[PDB]
Amino acid sequence: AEAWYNLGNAYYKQGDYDEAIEYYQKALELDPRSAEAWYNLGNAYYKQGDYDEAIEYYQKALELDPRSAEAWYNLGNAYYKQGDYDEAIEYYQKALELDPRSAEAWYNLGNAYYKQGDYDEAIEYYQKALELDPRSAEAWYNLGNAYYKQGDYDEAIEYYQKALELDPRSAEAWYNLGNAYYKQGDYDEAIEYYQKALELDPRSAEAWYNLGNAYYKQGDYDEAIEYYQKALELDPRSAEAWYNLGNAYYKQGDYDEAIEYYQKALELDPRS
Ligand SMILES: [Ba+2]
Ligand SMILES: [Ba+2]
Ligand SMILES: [Ba+2]
Ligand SMILES: [Ba+2]
Ligand SMILES: [Ba+2]
Ligand SMILES: [Ba+2]
Ligand SMILES: [Ba+2]
Ligand SMILES: [Ba+2]
């Protein structure tokens, strides 16, 4: 039994999974006992692209080893992709109840809790990432993200300034940081953080939209109408954006051309 396992493992180490899974099944023909192999068989399906396949083989590991923390975590993950967070949130804590020392799991727990519409709770968990280390750069975002989600902008704008300290390179953050000044009502403060986002990703159509929206508040339809087109050649599919263009040319005093754009918007969603 021993060898059939170590073999399947090296095929796991070449990205060969329906290949590995043959040999893992054969370890588990000889010895169904070793709940290492039951673990890994599920991990060669968490690869080969098979998730409620993986679960069954994790539960059969968690039969024979009921405090395999590593098996709780990845069973949690395997419902998290399938996308059922009732279940993941649970199995992720059955993981932490054993290993409360897991800025991995404590991160992955706020990613489950983030889709319960549930941000007041989901933030407790992210701050259990802060404690272990500030090393995990992604998660600095998802904090401020969840503060942005509760209309709680002043706070959000702090945690992207920490996000961007760490990776100045992420235009995701740059974008969202310019959005928290779009609500919290500080606009040419927003523009210049949308500009620092396009610098990094110029085919971001929504940077062009919400930067071009930010001049629209401050009256400046000279320059707002510019960016609204920069947006629309990069996505002609928008309804309330050919709309927002025509609303902008309506103020330029300019009805002849401002009408054509509303009809553009009316081809696509006529209902509204
Ligand atoms: Ba195949
Ligand atoms: Ba498949
Ligand atoms: Ba299913
Ligand atoms: Ba299925
Ligand atoms: Ba253990
Ligand atoms: Ba203010
Ligand atoms: Ba101004
Ligand atoms: Ba100002």
PDB file of C-alpha atoms and ligand atoms in Angstrom:
ATOM      1  CA  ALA A   1       0.000   0.000   0.000  1.00  0.00           C
ATOM      2  CA  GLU A   2       2.852   2.349   1.083  1.00  0.00           C
ATOM      3  CA  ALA A   3       4.490   2.841  -2.347  1.00  0.00           C
ATOM      4  CA  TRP A   4       1.281   3.338  -4.445  1.00  0.00           C
ATOM      5  CA  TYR A   5       0.691   6.481  -2.282  1.00  0.00           C
ATOM      6  CA  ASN A   6       4.208   8.057  -2.637  1.00  0.00           C
ATOM      7  CA  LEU A   7       3.884   7.398  -6.415  1.00  0.00           C
ATOM      8  CA  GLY A   8       0.439   9.077  -6.851  1.00  0.00           C
ATOM      9  CA  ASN A   9       2.016  11.976  -4.842  1.00  0.00           C
ATOM     10  CA  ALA A  10       4.835  12.616  -7.369  1.00  0.00           C
ATOM     11  CA  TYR A  11       2.158  12.629 -10.175  1.00  0.00           C
ATOM     12  CA  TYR A  12       0.350  15.271  -8.007  1.00  0.00           C
ATOM     13  CA  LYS A  13       3.745  17.097  -8.220  1.00  0.00           C
ATOM     14  CA  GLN A  14       3.625  17.209 -12.099  1.00  0.00           C
ATOM     15  CA  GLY A  15       0.013  18.584 -12.262  1.00  0.00           C
ATOM     16  CA  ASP A  16      -1.169  15.033 -13.299  1.00  0.00           C
ATOM     17  CA  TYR A  17      -4.362  14.490 -11.257  1.00  0.00           C
ATOM     18  CA  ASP A  18      -6.732  11.964 -12.972  1.00  0.00           C
ATOM     19  CA  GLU A  19      -3.217  10.310 -13.311  1.00  0.00           C
ATOM     20  CA  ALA A  20      -2.443  10.639  -9.529  1.00  0.00           C
ATOM     21  CA  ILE A  21      -6.071   9.693  -8.622  1.00  0.00           C
ATOM     22  CA  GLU A  22      -5.610   6.253 -10.282  1.00  0.00           C
ATOM     23  CA  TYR A  23      -2.652   5.407  -7.985  1.00  0.00           C
ATOM     24  CA  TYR A  24      -4.233   6.998  -4.832  1.00  0.00           C
ATOM     25  CA  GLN A  25      -7.305   4.691  -5.416  1.00  0.00           C
ATOM     26  CA  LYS A  26      -4.847   1.732  -5.431  1.00  0.00           C
ATOM     27  CA  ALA A  27      -3.102   2.696  -2.159  1.00  0.00           C
ATOM     28  CA  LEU A  28      -6.727   2.780  -0.838  1.00  0.00           C
ATOM     29  CA  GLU A  29      -7.567  -0.596  -2.484  1.00  0.00           C
ATOM     30  CA  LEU A  30      -4.773  -2.239  -0.379  1.00  0.00           C
ATOM     31  CA  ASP A  31      -5.205  -0.022   2.809  1.00  0.00           C
ATOM     32  CA  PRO A  32      -8.425   2.092   3.193  1.00  0.00           C
ATOM     33  CA  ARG A  33      -7.105   2.969   6.713  1.00  0.00           C
ATOM     34  CA  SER A  34      -4.403   5.595   5.902  1.00  0.00           C
ATOM     35  CA  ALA A  35      -6.448   8.869   5.986  1.00  0.00           C
ATOM     36  CA  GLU A  36      -3.474  10.673   4.355  1.00  0.00           C
ATOM     37  CA  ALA A  37      -4.426   9.054   0.997  1.00  0.00           C
ATOM     38  CA  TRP A  38      -8.184   9.833   1.495  1.00  0.00           C
ATOM     39  CA  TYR A  39      -7.092  13.474   2.033  1.00  0.00           C
ATOM     40  CA  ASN A  40      -4.897  13.649  -1.119  1.00  0.00           C
ATOM     41  CA  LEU A  41      -7.428  11.829  -3.404  1.00  0.00           C
ATOM     42  CA  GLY A  42      -9.766  14.751  -2.595  1.00  0.00           C
ATOM     43  CA  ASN A  43      -6.871  17.177  -3.357  1.00  0.00           C
ATOM     44  CA  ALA A  44      -6.356  15.578  -6.814  1.00  0.00           C
ATOM     45  CA  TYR A  45     -10.056  16.461  -7.481  1.00  0.00           C
ATOM     46  CA  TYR A  46      -9.742  19.964  -5.904  1.00  0.00           C
ATOM     47  CA  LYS A  47      -7.382  20.078  -8.941  1.00  0.00           C
ATOM     48  CA  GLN A  48      -8.747  17.901 -11.866  1.00  0.00           C
ATOM     49  CA  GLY A  49     -11.678  20.418 -11.457  1.00  0.00           C
ATOM     50  CA  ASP A  50     -14.168  18.397  -9.329  1.00  0.00           C
ATOM     51  CA  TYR A  51     -15.376  19.882  -6.009  1.00  0.00           C
ATOM     52  CA  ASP A  52     -18.284  17.760  -4.588  1.00  0.00           C
ATOM     53  CA  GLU A  53     -16.099  14.852  -5.799  1.00  0.00           C
ATOM     54  CA  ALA A  54     -13.310  16.174  -3.433  1.00  0.00           C
ATOM     55  CA  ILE A  55     -15.736  16.672  -0.447  1.00  0.00           C
ATOM     56  CA  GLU A  56     -16.764  12.968  -0.196  1.00  0.00           C
ATOM     57  CA  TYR A  57     -13.043  11.911  -0.019  1.00  0.00           C
ATOM     58  CA  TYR A  58     -12.320  14.617   2.645  1.00  0.00           C
ATOM     59  CA  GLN A  59     -15.272  13.394   4.808  1.00  0.00           C
ATOM     60  CA  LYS A  60     -13.798   9.834   4.534  1.00  0.00           C
ATOM     61  CA  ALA A  61     -10.451  11.271   5.810  1.00  0.00           C
ATOM     62  CA  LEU A  62     -12.346  13.135   8.589  1.00  0.00           C
ATOM     63  CA  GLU A  63     -13.941   9.758   9.484  1.00  0.00           C
ATOM     64  CA  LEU A  64     -10.530   8.124  10.173  1.00  0.00           C
ATOM     65  CA  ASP A  65      -8.853  11.389  11.342  1.00  0.00           C
ATOM     66  CA  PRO A  66     -11.507  13.642  12.964  1.00  0.00           C
ATOM     67  CA  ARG A  67      -9.054  16.460  13.982  1.00  0.00           C
ATOM     68  CA  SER A  68      -7.196  16.724  10.637  1.00  0.00           C
ATOM     69  CA  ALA A  69      -7.364  20.544  10.696  1.00  0.00           C
ATOM     70  CA  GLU A  70      -5.905  20.671   7.151  1.00  0.00           C
ATOM     71  CA  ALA A  71      -8.918  18.521   5.968  1.00  0.00           C
ATOM     72  CA  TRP A  72     -11.514  20.807   7.628  1.00  0.00           C
ATOM     73  CA  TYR A  73      -9.894  23.838   5.869  1.00  0.00           C
ATOM     74  CA  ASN A  74      -9.916  22.322   2.325  1.00  0.00           C
ATOM     75  CA  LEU A  75     -13.428  20.832   2.825  1.00  0.00           C
ATOM     76  CA  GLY A  76     -14.414  24.403   3.837  1.00  0.00           C
ATOM     77  CA  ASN A  77     -12.712  25.680   0.612  1.00  0.00           C
ATOM     78  CA  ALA A  78     -14.484  23.030  -1.549  1.00  0.00           C
ATOM     79  CA  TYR A  79     -17.964  24.431  -0.548  1.00  0.00           C
ATOM     80  CA  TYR A  80     -16.544  28.009  -0.905  1.00  0.00           C
ATOM     81  CA  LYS A  81     -15.966  27.504  -4.702  1.00  0.00           C
ATOM     82  CA  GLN A  82     -19.265  25.563  -5.150  1.00  0.00           C
ATOM     83  CA  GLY A  83     -20.292  28.804  -3.320  1.00  0.00           C
ATOM     84  CA  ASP A  84     -22.364  27.627  -0.253  1.00  0.00           C
ATOM     85  CA  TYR A  85     -21.020  29.744   2.709  1.00  0.00           C
ATOM     86  CA  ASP A  86     -23.568  28.487   5.291  1.00  0.00           C
ATOM     87  CA  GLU A  87     -21.411  25.294   5.032  1.00  0.00           C
ATOM     88  CA  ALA A  88     -17.892  26.815   4.438  1.00  0.00           C
ATOM     89  CA  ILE A  89     -18.247  29.332   7.334  1.00  0.00           C
ATOM     90  CA  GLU A  90     -19.001  26.262   9.547  1.00  0.00           C
ATOM     91  CA  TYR A  91     -16.269  23.866   8.341  1.00  0.00           C
ATOM     92  CA  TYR A  92     -13.756  26.845   8.399  1.00  0.00           C
ATOM     93  CA  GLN A  93     -14.401  27.276  12.209  1.00  0.00           C
ATOM     94  CA  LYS A  94     -14.279  23.487  12.883  1.00  0.00           C
ATOM     95  CA  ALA A  95     -10.790  24.149  11.339  1.00  0.00           C
ATOM     96  CA  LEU A  96      -9.951  27.178  13.558  1.00  0.00           C
ATOM     97  CA  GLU A  97     -11.373  25.542  16.765  1.00  0.00           C
ATOM     98  CA  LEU A  98      -8.258  23.343  16.280  1.00  0.00           C
ATOM     99  CA  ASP A  99      -5.839  25.899  14.628  1.00  0.00           C
ATOM    100  CA  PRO A 100      -6.775  29.490  15.775  1.00  0.00           C
ATOM    101  CA  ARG A 101      -3.317  30.495  14.366  1.00  0.00           C
ATOM    102  CA  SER A 102      -4.237  30.635  10.666  1.00  0.00           C
ATOM    103  CA  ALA A 103      -4.282  34.140   9.008  1.00  0.00           C
ATOM    104  CA  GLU A 104      -4.877  31.850   5.972  1.00  0.00           C
ATOM    105  CA  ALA A 105      -8.182  30.441   7.333  1.00  0.00           C
ATOM    106  CA  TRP A 106      -9.058  33.647   9.295  1.00  0.00           C
ATOM    107  CA  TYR A 107      -8.639  35.431   5.917  1.00  0.00           C
ATOM    108  CA  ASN A 108     -10.622  32.656   4.031  1.00  0.00           C
ATOM    109  CA  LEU A 109     -13.353  32.947   6.754  1.00  0.00           C
ATOM    110  CA  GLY A 110     -14.037  36.656   5.977  1.00  0.00           C
ATOM    111  CA  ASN A 111     -14.221  35.753   2.214  1.00  0.00           C
ATOM    112  CA  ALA A 112     -17.045  33.293   3.064  1.00  0.00           C
ATOM    113  CA  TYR A 113     -18.674  35.790   5.527  1.00  0.00           C
ATOM    114  CA  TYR A 114     -18.374  38.587   2.877  1.00  0.00           C
ATOM    115  CA  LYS A 115     -21.163  36.876   0.787  1.00  0.00           C
ATOM    116  CA  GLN A 116     -23.752  36.629   3.707  1.00  0.00           C
ATOM    117  CA  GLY A 117     -24.458  40.299   2.882  1.00  0.00           C
ATOM    118  CA  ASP A 118     -22.539  40.203   6.163  1.00  0.00           C
ATOM    119  CA  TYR A 119     -19.780  42.877   6.553  1.00  0.00           C
ATOM    120  CA  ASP A 120     -20.170  43.886  10.302  1.00  0.00           C
ATOM    121  CA  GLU A 121     -19.256  40.241  11.182  1.00  0.00           C
ATOM    122  CA  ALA A 122     -16.836  39.593   8.214  1.00  0.00           C
ATOM    123  CA  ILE A 123     -14.466  42.448   9.410  1.00  0.00           C
ATOM    124  CA  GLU A 124     -13.820  40.911  12.895  1.00  0.00           C
ATOM    125  CA  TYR A 125     -12.311  37.946  10.972  1.00  0.00           C
ATOM    126  CA  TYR A 126     -10.102  40.022   8.566  1.00  0.00           C
ATOM    127  CA  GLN A 127      -8.610  41.832  11.641  1.00  0.00           C
ATOM    128  CA  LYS A 128      -7.515  38.278  12.672  1.00  0.00           C
ATOM    129  CA  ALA A 129      -5.222  38.636   9.616  1.00  0.00           C
ATOM    130  CA  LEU A 130      -3.696  41.946  10.925  1.00  0.00           C
ATOM    131  CA  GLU A 131      -2.561  40.166  14.169  1.00  0.00           C
ATOM    132  CA  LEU A 132      -0.568  37.293  12.542  1.00  0.00           C
ATOM    133  CA  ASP A 133       1.142  39.630  10.002  1.00  0.00           C
ATOM    134  CA  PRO A 134       0.588  42.569   7.589  1.00  0.00           C
ATOM    135  CA  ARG A 135       2.481  40.353   4.999  1.00  0.00           C
ATOM    136  CA  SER A 136      -0.713  39.127   3.183  1.00  0.00           C
ATOM    137  CA  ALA A 137      -1.147  42.246   0.923  1.00  0.00           C
ATOM    138  CA  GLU A 138      -4.466  41.147  -0.753  1.00  0.00           C
ATOM    139  CA  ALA A 139      -6.439  41.196   2.541  1.00  0.00           C
ATOM    140  CA  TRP A 140      -5.701  44.937   3.279  1.00  0.00           C
ATOM    141  CA  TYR A 141      -8.068  45.650   0.346  1.00  0.00           C
ATOM    142  CA  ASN A 142     -10.884  43.280   1.473  1.00  0.00           C
ATOM    143  CA  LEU A 143     -10.954  45.029   4.871  1.00  0.00           C
ATOM    144  CA  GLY A 144     -11.466  48.541   3.378  1.00  0.00           C
ATOM    145  CA  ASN A 145     -13.784  46.871   0.791  1.00  0.00           C
ATOM    146  CA  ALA A 146     -16.078  45.705   3.649  1.00  0.00           C
ATOM    147  CA  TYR A 147     -15.912  49.205   5.284  1.00  0.00           C
ATOM    148  CA  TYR A 148     -16.851  50.714   1.827  1.00  0.00           C
ATOM    149  CA  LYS A 149     -19.808  48.222   1.767  1.00  0.00           C
ATOM    150  CA  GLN A 150     -21.409  49.563   5.027  1.00  0.00           C
ATOM    151  CA  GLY A 151     -21.297  53.202   3.719  1.00  0.00           C
ATOM    152  CA  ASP A 152     -18.283  53.492   6.158  1.00  0.00           C
ATOM    153  CA  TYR A 153     -15.866  55.425   3.881  1.00  0.00           C
ATOM    154  CA  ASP A 154     -13.545  57.495   6.169  1.00  0.00           C
ATOM    155  CA  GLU A 155     -12.449  54.059   7.638  1.00  0.00           C
ATOM    156  CA  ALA A 156     -12.175  52.357   4.173  1.00  0.00           C
ATOM    157  CA  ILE A 157      -9.917  55.201   2.849  1.00  0.00           C
ATOM    158  CA  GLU A 158      -7.393  54.395   5.663  1.00  0.00           C
ATOM    159  CA  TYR A 159      -7.104  50.646   4.820  1.00  0.00           C
ATOM    160  CA  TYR A 160      -6.410  51.217   1.061  1.00  0.00           C
ATOM    161  CA  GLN A 161      -3.633  53.764   2.077  1.00  0.00           C
ATOM    162  CA  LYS A 162      -2.163  50.729   3.906  1.00  0.00           C
ATOM    163  CA  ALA A 163      -3.073  48.470   0.890  1.00  0.00           C
ATOM    164  CA  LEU A 164      -1.252  50.868  -1.518  1.00  0.00           C
ATOM    165  CA  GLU A 165       1.733  51.404   0.859  1.00  0.00           C
ATOM    166  CA  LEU A 166       2.299  47.599   0.410  1.00  0.00           C
ATOM    167  CA  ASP A 167       1.490  47.192  -3.374  1.00  0.00           C
ATOM    168  CA  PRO A 168       1.479  50.636  -5.120  1.00  0.00           C
ATOM    169  CA  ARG A 169       0.992  48.547  -8.336  1.00  0.00           C
ATOM    170  CA  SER A 170      -2.675  47.414  -7.741  1.00  0.00           C
ATOM    171  CA  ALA A 171      -5.059  49.714  -9.719  1.00  0.00           C
ATOM    172  CA  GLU A 172      -7.954  47.720  -8.098  1.00  0.00           C
ATOM    173  CA  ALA A 173      -7.208  49.631  -4.836  1.00  0.00           C
ATOM    174  CA  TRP A 174      -6.392  52.960  -6.627  1.00  0.00           C
ATOM    175  CA  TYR A 175      -9.876  52.645  -8.234  1.00  0.00           C
ATOM    176  CA  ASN A 176     -11.782  51.863  -5.001  1.00  0.00           C
ATOM    177  CA  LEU A 177      -9.777  54.592  -3.065  1.00  0.00           C
ATOM    178  CA  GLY A 178     -11.084  57.120  -5.631  1.00  0.00           C
ATOM    179  CA  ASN A 179     -14.643  55.703  -5.066  1.00  0.00           C
ATOM    180  CA  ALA A 180     -14.609  56.262  -1.247  1.00  0.00           C
ATOM    181  CA  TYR A 181     -13.997  59.993  -2.024  1.00  0.00           C
ATOM    182  CA  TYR A 182     -16.946  59.834  -4.486  1.00  0.00           C
ATOM    183  CA  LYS A 183     -19.387  59.028  -1.612  1.00  0.00           C
ATOM    184  CA  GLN A 184     -17.568  60.806   1.335  1.00  0.00           C
ATOM    185  CA  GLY A 185     -18.089  63.793  -1.040  1.00  0.00           C
ATOM    186  CA  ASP A 186     -14.490  64.840  -1.977  1.00  0.00           C
ATOM    187  CA  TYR A 187     -14.356  64.743  -5.787  1.00  0.00           C
ATOM    188  CA  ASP A 188     -11.141  66.180  -7.378  1.00  0.00           C
ATOM    189  CA  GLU A 189      -9.607  64.259  -4.416  1.00  0.00           C
ATOM    190  CA  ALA A 190     -11.269  61.203  -6.158  1.00  0.00           C
ATOM    191  CA  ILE A 191     -10.274  62.094  -9.806  1.00  0.00           C
ATOM    192  CA  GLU A 192      -6.540  62.065  -8.899  1.00  0.00           C
ATOM    193  CA  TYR A 193      -6.839  58.505  -7.394  1.00  0.00           C
ATOM    194  CA  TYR A 194      -8.770  57.361 -10.551  1.00  0.00           C
ATOM    195  CA  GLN A 195      -5.873  58.878 -12.647  1.00  0.00           C
ATOM    196  CA  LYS A 196      -3.345  56.929 -10.476  1.00  0.00           C
ATOM    197  CA  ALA A 197      -5.435  53.808 -11.422  1.00  0.00           C
ATOM    198  CA  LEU A 198      -5.517  54.331 -15.258  1.00  0.00           C
ATOM    199  CA  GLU A 199      -1.728  54.994 -15.161  1.00  0.00           C
ATOM    200  CA  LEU A 200      -1.626  51.264 -14.188  1.00  0.00           C
ATOM    201  CA  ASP A 201      -4.680  49.886 -16.217  1.00  0.00           C
ATOM    202  CA  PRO A 202      -5.811  52.167 -19.099  1.00  0.00           C
ATOM    203  CA  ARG A 203      -8.373  49.664 -20.557  1.00  0.00           C
ATOM    204  CA  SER A 204     -10.342  49.966 -17.230  1.00  0.00           C
ATOM    205  CA  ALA A 205     -13.635  51.236 -18.728  1.00  0.00           C
ATOM    206  CA  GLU A 206     -15.107  52.048 -15.278  1.00  0.00           C
ATOM    207  CA  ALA A 207     -12.118  54.219 -14.239  1.00  0.00           C
ATOM    208  CA  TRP A 208     -12.909  56.273 -17.416  1.00  0.00           C
ATOM    209  CA  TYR A 209     -16.653  56.267 -16.376  1.00  0.00           C
ATOM    210  CA  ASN A 210     -16.350  57.247 -12.630  1.00  0.00           C
ATOM    211  CA  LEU A 211     -13.384  59.654 -13.260  1.00  0.00           C
ATOM    212  CA  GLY A 212     -15.615  61.199 -16.010  1.00  0.00           C
ATOM    213  CA  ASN A 213     -18.535  61.193 -13.480  1.00  0.00           C
ATOM    214  CA  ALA A 214     -16.330  63.055 -10.910  1.00  0.00           C
ATOM    215  CA  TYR A 215     -15.947  66.116 -13.266  1.00  0.00           C
ATOM    216  CA  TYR A 216     -19.728  65.816 -13.956  1.00  0.00           C
ATOM    217  CA  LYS A 217     -20.489  66.724 -10.245  1.00  0.00           C
ATOM    218  CA  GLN A 218     -18.074  69.754 -10.352  1.00  0.00           C
ATOM    219  CA  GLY A 219     -20.014  71.021 -13.428  1.00  0.00           C
ATOM    220  CA  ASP A 220     -17.089  70.517 -15.893  1.00  0.00           C
ATOM    221  CA  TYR A 221     -18.791  68.897 -18.974  1.00  0.00           C
ATOM    222  CA  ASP A 222     -15.901  70.209 -21.147  1.00  0.00           C
ATOM    223  CA  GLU A 223     -13.776  67.371 -19.749  1.00  0.00           C
ATOM    224  CA  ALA A 224     -16.496  64.934 -18.386  1.00  0.00           C
ATOM    225  CA  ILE A 225     -17.938  64.279 -21.917  1.00  0.00           C
ATOM    226  CA  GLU A 226     -14.356  63.510 -23.066  1.00  0.00           C
ATOM    227  CA  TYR A 227     -13.856  60.593 -20.601  1.00  0.00           C
ATOM    228  CA  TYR A 228     -17.492  59.334 -21.084  1.00  0.00           C
ATOM    229  CA  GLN A 229     -16.522  58.560 -24.778  1.00  0.00           C
ATOM    230  CA  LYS A 230     -13.029  57.223 -23.800  1.00  0.00           C
ATOM    231  CA  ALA A 231     -15.245  54.780 -21.844  1.00  0.00           C
ATOM    232  CA  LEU A 232     -17.829  54.057 -24.603  1.00  0.00           C
ATOM    233  CA  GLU A 233     -15.336  53.048 -27.361  1.00  0.00           C
ATOM    234  CA  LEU A 234     -14.022  50.644 -24.675  1.00  0.00           C
ATOM    235  CA  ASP A 235     -17.635  49.459 -24.026  1.00  0.00           C
ATOM    236  CA  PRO A 236     -20.472  50.661 -26.340  1.00  0.00           C
ATOM    237  CA  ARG A 237     -22.815  48.245 -24.325  1.00  0.00           C
ATOM    238  CA  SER A 238     -23.691  50.782 -21.519  1.00  0.00           C
ATOM    239  CA  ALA A 239     -27.292  52.126 -21.052  1.00  0.00           C
ATOM    240  CA  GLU A 240     -27.049  54.801 -18.255  1.00  0.00           C
ATOM    241  CA  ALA A 241     -23.559  55.747 -19.683  1.00  0.00           C
ATOM    242  CA  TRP A 242     -24.646  56.818 -23.202  1.00  0.00           C
ATOM    243  CA  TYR A 243     -27.432  58.195 -20.933  1.00  0.00           C
ATOM    244  CA  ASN A 244     -24.898  60.045 -18.670  1.00  0.00           C
ATOM    245  CA  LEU A 245     -23.130  61.289 -21.857  1.00  0.00           C
ATOM    246  CA  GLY A 246     -26.385  62.849 -23.150  1.00  0.00           C
ATOM    247  CA  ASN A 247     -27.180  64.265 -19.653  1.00  0.00           C
ATOM    248  CA  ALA A 248     -23.706  65.924 -19.941  1.00  0.00           C
ATOM    249  CA  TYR A 249     -24.301  67.337 -23.485  1.00  0.00           C
ATOM    250  CA  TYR A 250     -27.757  68.549 -22.202  1.00  0.00           C
ATOM    251  CA  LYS A 251     -25.877  70.972 -19.867  1.00  0.00           C
ATOM    252  CA  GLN A 252     -23.303  72.039 -22.613  1.00  0.00           C
ATOM    253  CA  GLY A 253     -26.541  73.772 -23.876  1.00  0.00           C
ATOM    254  CA  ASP A 254     -26.449  71.351 -26.765  1.00  0.00           C
ATOM    255  CA  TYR A 255     -29.739  69.495 -27.536  1.00  0.00           C
ATOM    256  CA  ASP A 256     -29.235  68.524 -31.273  1.00  0.00           C
ATOM    257  CA  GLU A 257     -26.367  66.072 -30.349  1.00  0.00           C
ATOM    258  CA  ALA A 258     -27.529  65.454 -26.702  1.00  0.00           C
ATOM    259  CA  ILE A 259     -30.710  63.779 -28.168  1.00  0.00           C
ATOM    260  CA  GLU A 260     -28.833  61.265 -30.410  1.00  0.00           C
ATOM    261  CA  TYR A 261     -27.026  59.868 -27.299  1.00  0.00           C
ATOM    262  CA  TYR A 262     -30.257  59.263 -25.242  1.00  0.00           C
ATOM    263  CA  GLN A 263     -31.626  57.217 -28.237  1.00  0.00           C
ATOM    264  CA  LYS A 264     -28.298  55.273 -28.296  1.00  0.00           C
ATOM    265  CA  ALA A 265     -29.127  54.462 -24.619  1.00  0.00           C
ATOM    266  CA  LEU A 266     -32.777  53.674 -25.650  1.00  0.00           C
ATOM    267  CA  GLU A 267     -31.883  51.028 -28.330  1.00  0.00           C
ATOM    268  CA  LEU A 268     -30.175  48.862 -25.638  1.00  0.00           C
ATOM    269  CA  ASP A 269     -32.645  49.036 -22.633  1.00  0.00           C
ATOM    270  CA  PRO A 270     -35.866  50.599 -24.084  1.00  0.00           C
ATOM    271  CA  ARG A 271     -37.958  49.643 -20.922  1.00  0.00           C
ATOM    272  CA  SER A 272     -36.154  52.349 -18.835  1.00  0.00           C
TER     273      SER A 272
HETATM  274 BA    BA B   1      -8.954  15.010 -18.539  1.00  0.00          BA
HETATM  275 BA    BA B   2     -13.268  17.537 -14.974  1.00  0.00          BA
HETATM  276 BA    BA B   3     -23.133  20.322  -5.987  1.00  0.00          BA
HETATM  277 BA    BA B   4     -21.250  17.409  -9.650  1.00  0.00          BA
HETATM  278 BA    BA B   5      -4.158  17.065  13.945  1.00  0.00          BA
HETATM  279 BA    BA B   6     -15.775  66.039   3.838  1.00  0.00          BA
HETATM  280 BA    BA B   7     -12.742  71.693  -8.375  1.00  0.00          BA
HETATM  281 BA    BA B   8     -10.746  70.598  -3.377  1.00  0.00          BA
END
